[PDB]
């Protein structure tokens, strides 16, 4: 994944590590649903 260092700042936001993990989970779910 590309780097957006502005996202690492925690002011009014969830930790980027866990946002990234959740995004990967969503992508994997979509890939399973498509059947790839």
Write out the residues near RNA by the rule CB under 7 A.
1-12, 14-24, 26-30, 33-36
d(CA 21, CA 25): 6
**CB 10 → RNA: shortest distance, Å?**
4
**Number of Cβ within a 10 Å radius of residue 16:** 15
CB of 32 to RNA, least distance (A): 9
User: In angstroms, what is the minimal distance from the CB of 9 to RNA?
Assistant: 6
Of the candidates 17, 15, 11, the residue with the CA atom closest to the CA atom of residue 1? 17
């Amino acid at each position: 994944m590309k780097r957006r260092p502005r996202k690492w700042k925690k002011k009014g936001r969830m930790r980027w590590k866990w946002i990234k993990k959740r995004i990967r989970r969503l992508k994997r779910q979509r890939k399973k649903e498509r059947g790839l």
